[model samples]
Target chain A: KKEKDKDSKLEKALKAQNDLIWNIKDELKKVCSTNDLKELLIFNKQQVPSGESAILDRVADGMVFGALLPCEECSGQLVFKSDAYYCTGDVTAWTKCMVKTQTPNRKEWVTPKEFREISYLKKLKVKKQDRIFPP
Target chain B: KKEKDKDSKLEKALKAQNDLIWNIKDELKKVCSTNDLKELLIFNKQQVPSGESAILDRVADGMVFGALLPCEECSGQLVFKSDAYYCTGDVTAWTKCMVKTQTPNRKEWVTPKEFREISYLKKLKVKKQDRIFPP
Candidate 1:
């Protein structure tokens, strides 16, 4: 029962994200009456900060920047900035837990696509006391 | 017929803007998979530049910052930047007959919503012989 509940909760969050995207697009189209909607696309494209978005090197799936997500390490929220997913602490804030997403050693890591298939909760988790592989 | 076409076109643009608002929310909710989706909202908001976006005090309609629309002056495209919407140029470029959305005399024009209800092709028209109503 716990397992099923977890899955259901994850699905619900994903559904909400999908809904918001459509609603924004629908309204902007009416306000900007033109065949050329390139500006909107460009603006949305540029705002997204550089990071591992969508488990792919390139995130051209019409996603915008400045997106917020849930942190896997704790109950805090992960903020998608230009470089990392910053964790805003549950009890306090960024000034509190200062955790951000970081890619593990590339030499021994699985491909992003393969990594994506893992448990969704494992997304962008960084463990401490791990040895760093020197370049 | 001509006058009616103008109204229809302007109305269509306004409608599209409204529709996009809802659509974006629908999709992002499914994919982003988070309830703390403040990052997405923030990303969209920050991308917009300092300009006359809605003619009001602020734009908090779940709107994305990177939006595109047609030029109100010529057959060009306007890009919403961190500052202003520049015309990509119709015949040549911003290098061509460059134009943009400019706020007219604050002491002479109507409200933004009212201004929007005017001629569809005259939103950001800048004339050469016009005088500067400086403060």
Candidate 2:
């Protein structure tokens, strides 16, 4: 019975995660242009590390709310979280680029905290996908 | 606006189909043994035709409720629907075997109409996956 319960919990978690991914994709369809959509798909299909630890860094460095942003160094994608950015590229190289490019004037920049405070964000499923750097 | 609406409709349809497939998989997890789950995953990953025309043959021939059954001819699986069983094998050969083995008491045999009449079936998503024949 305990084993079955554990299986059920894991199953539910997987399903919830799948649904969250689905809704994130759906939300992207609403906001992204054709090119943005293609880029988003490519970013997702990239075989990077899962971005969990990096996500803990900061909105500029990690994947904020699971949203992808363009990386400063590699011209690839980055996930903003914690105090830093996470990318599939060399961590040291990306970190240097992040520090050099960090700015208060970057349009639409919102930390995970500020993102949660937005009234309109409540309507978006999955907090991170709702307010990424790009849109 | 029209193009946006069209995109939204298509996205909704795709999401609905994905969710239906997900639920079907979740239900299988509940009912299937470990071996049965492995067989199902193999059957789905098989690159057979989409099983539309073959499925139109008969419930005895198609996948009952989108569930996999051992093929009568090849060492594989079949999807029951219409008046036929859809298999990854040679169509003519599998059809002959289907005819040879079909019986009134083959257990849980149901016509598409009869299957729909069962009140519990409406809760299942996607008409084709809900009732092929073998349920």
Candidate 3:
């Protein structure tokens, strides 16, 4: 008998997945912050890192929550906690970023679909927020 | 202003995934053992367990390795060790199943795509295999 082909169904299914992922970027663009999007774009062109596909898949699914943007005040990354996004500086050096959403509301802080709708941030930058310190 | 639709794109994309997962079981049929397939089928109809989608997704992607079936002699699930599948009973209770693959036939063990091609199991069942106790 002639040579038998294995995974012919797998091959076709894989191509279908190829087709879906082609549109993955456009879907991700809607949920990720511009900074996150730019970073992902750069990473897209960079060398392959073994663990990145997990994040790419999460981002496409609108499941990622939290920041890559450093806190403008504390220089810490805004980390997601149970109820809010807070500066990692609060944990390490105790530098207050005031760069946090009020405790709780955390899951939605970076929840992409709701991120756009829930910007209940109190003044976030140093110059405007904490600048009201005793004249 | 239009009361904006949230997750409109997400809705459509989710339905496409709905379509994809419909075919997931058929794809898993080619790669999984009969016991694993039956377990998944049971799981498909059972009550919601939070972590199960991970396995379902892995099965569809052909990413799972190791056993869901109990060892016939050891009564423990055969777990994939660094280089082979071993009865977990060997670890805790030390019951030798004689029901395991040989040492280090495992370069082919971890990857899901290669599972069907490699079955270098040493005598696996109790009745036909280890029952031949000395002459």
Candidate 4:
């Protein structure tokens, strides 16, 4: 029974990850298709840091920069505000412990400072150690 | 009224971005500080393709690879199995429109292939114009 449960759990997690990839990929297509990089807002819960991001880290003095936001299922409100997007954390309830779906999240364009302040990453910090890697 | 709405929307979007930064940061701290890079599953939705990621992109074909997972509020259930984690998307019931919380998502780490198979990226091809960036 324990073995079966373990396999079931693995399958479940794998499926969720796969589903998430598709969801994010779809969003990417939509944003990039617009041909306006400036109007796009991409979110990644497991984003690498500026120094650790992919190519930006090696661009002489370049640093990898990134941003993330709540999903539509969790934030009852995902909409485009001018050239940006927004999402509210209070939008989710029961499954607040498992999965997230990327909805058409939109908000205003602002510097990274403003974006980091209200992201869900704030409360997800399980401990002080969690501060290094944002959600 | 339109101006007020626009300003309110901007404020809301900015707040959401801020919240997302903190959330992801906290998560990063958890995975890295643990000194468990292998066990640590880093995700970034806006993750540039393998060749476009931060440091990896310039690392002589070191390609930037990434993975994404469903957040707690959308997956309904998240748990770790052996060294993996799982989430069920149907778990969520309401607010299936705007926000997502990175709950204690724990999944068994596997080859990126398996993860990608069930990820949300497949359906996101959006006319194939976006596939070129995946490398």
Candidate 5:
């Protein structure tokens, strides 16, 4: 009887954890569908590494609020994010060019943070977003 | 002044429409990444013909709810929908075998509608689903 009770408890705990995970996933799904985030937060979590999250976040905010700038190095398009993803040649050059195009007054390209501050960010469904941010 | 006013009004109207379209697009992007629909509605609408909507809807419903079955004609999978897609030589045969396995009592394979009735369904963001269905 004691062994049976322990097994039952283990099963319950596992089930509770699974339910919680599913609930969080469902909520994320709702946010992705309705916002510019584009289920991107969920997609990145599932498929890509955490390292890409910062860049992805920048793109989300930049597309929402920053100016759409053309690349300096090539004909490629660069969003608010400074990271220039190369479609053809040197992506870095393209990105730098875009920065020049956006802030002509400044000698160097503007940072991704600049764009985020300039634009309005639509909040996501995630709870206490600040908790996730590094202090 | 007259020419400029006309040009500006036309420009504003076009801009307003484009903004509205972009807004709707952004919202949908958020939903697709998180939702089970997996950008299918947008992908289908953009690429595939409209006639396939019903089948696509059934696949989505079945995946969310009803049982996943084997195909009757070939080695392919038979989803909640009644339509049997052929993955291999005889997917239809495979589907029939699966139905036979699912319901021992019933002689014939079950219909897609039947599976829908038994399972729980997740709702999407569309305003009214009734308008699109055949009356």
Candidate 6:
């Protein structure tokens, strides 16, 4: 039962990624010329990892730099600046814990100063020694 | 008809940006744990411009300091370094120009040197005019 649940969870997560991709394509079609859309879609698709490899493990591989915001779904914080944006804490779990189909707003976007003040609230209760990577 | 075409083109381009925002959220869920995904998604949505304003006009509003890649959409280039990524010059047009839903690859990703080499290509075809913004 546990194994099945794990498989289902992963399946759901992958679907979310795929759906997001499709949705973006649809959106791009509106603004981009056909040739431009074709080119971008081709390049963007290349970044997806093969299904066999777990995505959660690789989430930590990239660097993080930008403005931080709080996750509506959890205590975790989100960072946004430039082209990069991603989560960095408990909200990293595989359960579809995010604003799935909602429109984003300016009020919800936290400033750097606001992020610094609230970031600690979402931190996991781990020992200082256990905190190998302190963000 | 020309006005209609222009308006449609702008709509498409704006849709692409919105779609990209949604798509990235879905991708983050698979690789990120719940907290992490939450954090990343929130940050990603924040960077999106409010719909009342034009996105293309603001494309160059932020800083660009990262890896440079050829824009699959146009002769223009895409730069991704740290938290920044966007098209400059010709591709900066509002006609839905950009990668849209495509994933970025490390190999396709250019280092600063490679980016600098390619960067000059997309520059507006103009000689030094009254210096406004000289990079």
| Model 5: how far residue B104 lies from native, Å | 54
Off by over 4 Å in 5: A1-135, B33-135
Reference-based lDDT, residue B98, model 6? 48
For model 1, residues A84-131, the per-residue Cα lDDT tens digits are: 556665644534666776321111111122212221212211221111
Best by DockQ: 4
> Candidate 3 — which residues are off by over 4 angstroms?
A1-135, B1-4, B36-58, B61-110, B116-135
Residues B72-95, candidate 6: write the lDDT tens digits. 567444433333455543644466
Model 1: CAPRI class: incorrect
Model 6: per-residue Cα lDDT over A47-100, one tens digit each: 223332222112211101111234556644343322333433364556644442
Q: What is each predicted model's overall lDDT from 0 to 1?
A: 0.35, 0.34, 0.36, 0.31, 0.32, 0.31
True contacts kept of 3: 0.00
How far residue B99's Cα lies from its native spot in candidate 5, in Å, is 51
Structural RMSD, model 4: 28.0
Ranking by TM-score: 1, 5, 2, 3, 6, 4
TM-score of the A-chain for all models: 0.31, 0.32, 0.28, 0.26, 0.28, 0.29
lDDT of 5 by residue, A63-95 (tens): 223323334455444332232332222446343
State each model's TM-score restricted to chain B.
0.29, 0.31, 0.29, 0.26, 0.28, 0.26
**Once model 5 is optimally superposed onto the true structure by TM-score, how far is the C-alpha of residue B83 displaced, in angstroms?**
42
Report RMSD (Å) for each prediction in the order shown. Answer: 25.5, 23.1, 27.8, 28.0, 27.1, 26.9
Pick out the ten consecutive residues of candidate 5 chain A with the lowest summed lDDT: A126-135
CAPRI-style docking class of model 2 based on DockQ: incorrect
- How far out, in Å, is residue A126 in model 4? 15
lDDT of 3 by residue, A1-135 (tens): 122343555456556544444455444443355555435433322111234454454343222222244455655545444345566555355435556663312122122322322111111101111000111
Q: Residue A78 CA error for candidate 1 (Å)?
A: 19
DockQ, prediction 3: 0.01
